[PDB]
Design a protein around this ligand. Structure first.
Ligand SMILES: O=c1ccn([C@@H]2O[C@H](COP(=O)(O)OP(=O)(O)O)[C@@H](O)[C@H]2O)c(=O)[nH]1
Length: 419
């Protein structure tokens, strides 16, 4: 059971290169299934889901290779089923569905448990495909989609916003006959990025990043080279790492425009920020941060994925700051952990009241959410003494070797075992 042993305090500073976004990488790999020619998917981080998708892909008949890149040649796909064995660990597996039937005429993805008493609905994908003209076949534990010929552009109004469904529907639509409109489509940068990837393969997509995405079906998708966008959340974590340690940090391979809310929020914290087209700088000038007020909300507003981090920030800044989760609930489980570190806060309903304190104290802490989990490691950094963060596999799944990046930042950190 991997644990993070952190020795603090230490001012985090210097340079950090941001990994590709796990959440743009995933949809793009599945979308690659659409490519009739070899594709170079660049800037793909090395995470477990990447490994899982690669397997799933190989299993489909696609020649799959990786490094910084993930080389994909899909023109041999002859197995149209993501088996229970492969999709078991990965929800995103569902993304195999649309590409399969849109390009091949059929696709079957396994629904682990599915109707398993607690199963995150996958209905949007299934129903989206249906609107597109796909024949659906449902039996406990699986979903089969097929179609005689091409998919049929359709007008789809989404009742629930879904990053997931948006990728499915938008992906299948690139091959369908005619035009497809997605109302209430997810607006996330990762969607814009997946759409851009498709346009790169010859697809006709517009409105990516808005509420309405329009897709004009085309003949076939080619190949090419494509760089996955940077990890916006990863970038924010690192910005925050310096913002709370009085550090100065430069984020390499970043993408400023995906962090409007986060950047403005840091300025409020008194941070000194500069940006270029591919880099972001944050400078505290040895200064402790100022308490800020935050409202997480749907993109492009303040990203809930930045919450645990800003909370931590507030917890060590000058003043009082309230962080309010407007959409999500129960997003404060990691706070008691921070309190065990000397932090002062009151969790009230969907909000956390923060009383910035001078210095944190080492402690054995733990969290399930990668973000909250990352914040703990961050805390270990600036806290007095020894901090041991348990079950860091959570972080390993979404952060590409955070310890290495942290060490180069001046952090005293050891990956240790408790088993
Ligand atoms: O087929 C679907 C897809 C999404 N959702 C709902 O929309 C939320 C967020 O969807 P999204 O695709 O953004 O994320 P995911 O569910 O993949 O974690 C989910 O938790 C569900 O509550 C649903 O009910 N059915």
């Amino acid at each position: 059971m991997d644990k993070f042993r952190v020795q603090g305090p230490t001012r985090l500073q210097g340079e950090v290169t941001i990994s590709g976004a796990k959440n743009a990488a995933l949809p793009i790999l599945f979308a690659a299934l659409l490519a009739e020619e070899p594709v170079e998917i660049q800037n793909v981080p090395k995470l477990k889901d990447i490994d899982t998708t690669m397997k799933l892909l190989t299993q489909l008949g696609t020649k799959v290779e990786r490094x910084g890149s993930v080389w994909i040649d899909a023109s041999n796909v002859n197995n149209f089923s993501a088996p229970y064995d492969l999709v078991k660990t990965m929800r995103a597996s569902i993304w195999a569905l649309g590409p399969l039937v849109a390009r091949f005429g059929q696709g079957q993805v396994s629904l682990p448990g599915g109707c398993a008493i607690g199963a995150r609905p996958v209905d949007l994908h299934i129903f989206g495909l249906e609107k597109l003209g796909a024949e659906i076949k449902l039996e406990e534990g699986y979903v089969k989609a097929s179609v005689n010929g091409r998919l049929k552009g359709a007008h789809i109004v989404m009742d629930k916003v879904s990053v997931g469904a948006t990728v499915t529907i938008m992906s299948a639509a690139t091959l369908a006959e005619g035009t497809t409109i997605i109302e209430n489509a997810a607006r996330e940068p990762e969607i814009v990025d997946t759409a851009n990837f498709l346009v790169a393969l010859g697809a006709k997509i517009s409105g990516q990043g808005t509420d309405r995405i329009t897709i004009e079906g085309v003949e076939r998708l080619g190949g090419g080279v494509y760089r996955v966008l940077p990890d916006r959340i990863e970038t924010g974590t690192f910005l925050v790492a310096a913002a709370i340690s009085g550090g100065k940090i430069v984020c390499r391979n970043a993408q400023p425009d995906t962090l409007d809310a986060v950047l403005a929020k840091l300025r409020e914290a008194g941070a000194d920020i500069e940006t270029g087209e591919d880099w972001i700088s944050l400078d505290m000038h040895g200064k402790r941060p100022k308490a800020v007020t935050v409202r997480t909300a749907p993109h492009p507003a303040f990203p809930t994925d930045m919450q645990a981090q800003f909370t931590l920030l507030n917890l060590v800044a000058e003043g009082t700051g309230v962080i309010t989760e407007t959409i999500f609930e129960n997003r404060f489980m990691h706070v008691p952990e921070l309190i065990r570190m000397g932090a002062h806060a009151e969790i009230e309903s969907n909000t956390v009241i923060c009383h910035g304190v001078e210095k944190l104290s080492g402690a054995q802490v733990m969290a399930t959410d990668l973000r909250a989990s990352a914040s703990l490691v961050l805390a270990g950094c600036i806290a007095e003494g020894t901090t041991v963060v348990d079950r860091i596999y959570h972080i390993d799944r979404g952060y590409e070797r955070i310890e290495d990046k942290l060490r180069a930042l001046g952090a005293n950190i050891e990956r240790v075992k408790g088993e």
